[PDB]
């Protein structure tokens, strides 16, 4: 990755890189606003758009998909990226579009799905789609939400709120929970999500913040893990990440804590 970001080191990805593991032969679907395939540092292997007003998945008129894609590659430089456009330029999309993108990912034999997106409500159909993906062997990772806290209530968004999906909250460089990061018993793990520098459309770079930024660290970590252990099931990859996380505090706020890909891939 051409923009330096602390998050890669924080999750202990360089340790895998030094072992020789970079996520080769792992197909990662980036479900979001598209990916700018013209960026010189991003190669996109395939994709599809489900946003009727924005028909090209290989451009990104938001910036977030491009950024996220870059973070997956910063963590897993050999991963194969697929651009699955389910949100428009303003970051919004319809439930059905998301589901369409999930279906696409299952049909095209994705290894990992990253969903840096959320709604305060889901649907039985969305639950069925993610549960089908998990039954099919896909590692399914989602941003936990940017709804902060709500007393004792969970503020984790869908689809992260569904049990079959790995729900990823955001910490800063000091492992403190970001003020925006959603909370609740559905949180699984945390990853860097504050001022993360990555690729932007038009050959640019810059920092963004959000649980959107934390999710691709975990998607990239899953790619690293699968490169070292291509026979592990999605269940085993998930267990590896959760069981070896660095505990940070109360699980309502932090889940199992910060992912440690070095430990997870042992």
């Amino acid at each position: 990755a051409k923009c330096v970001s602390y998050g890669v080191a924080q999750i202990k990805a360089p340790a895998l890189h030094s072992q020789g593991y970079t996520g080769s032969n792992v197909k990662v679907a980036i479900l979001g606003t598209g990916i700018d395939s013209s960026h010189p540092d991003l190669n996109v292997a395939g994709g599809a758009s489900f946003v009727p007003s924005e028909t090209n998945p290989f451009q990104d008129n938001s910036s977030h998909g491009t950024h996220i894609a870059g973070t997956v590659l910063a963590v897993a430089p050999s991963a194969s990226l697929y651009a699955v456009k389910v949100l428009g330029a303003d970051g919004s999309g319809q439930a059905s579009w998301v589901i369409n993108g999930i279906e696409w990912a299952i049909a095209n034999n994705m290894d990992v799905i990253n969903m840096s997106l959320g709604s305060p409500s889901g649907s039985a159909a969305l639950k069925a789609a993610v549960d089908k993906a998990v039954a099919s062997g896909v590692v399914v990772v989602a941003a936990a939400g940017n709804s902060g806290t709500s007393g004792s209530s969970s503020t984790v968004t869908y689809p992260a709120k569904y049990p079959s999906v790995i729900a990823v909250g955001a910490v800063d460089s000091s492992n403190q929970r970001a003020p925006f990061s959603s909370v609740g018993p559905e949180l699984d793990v945390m990853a860097p999500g504050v001022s993360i520098c990555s690729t932007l459309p038009g050959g640019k770079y810059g920092a963004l913040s959000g649980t959107s930024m934390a999710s691709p660290h975990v998607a990239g970590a899953a790619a690293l893990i699968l490169s070292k252990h291509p026979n592990w099931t999605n269940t085993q990859v998930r267990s590896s990440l959760e069981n070896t996380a660095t505990k940070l505090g109360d699980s309502f706020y932090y889940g199992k804590g910060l992912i440690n890909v070095e430990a997870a891939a042992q």
Binding site: G32, L87, S92, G93, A95, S116, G118, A143, S212, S215
Partner: peptide, 5 residues
Amino acid sequence: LFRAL
């Protein structure tokens, strides 16, 4: 709606 986080 779903939204980018």
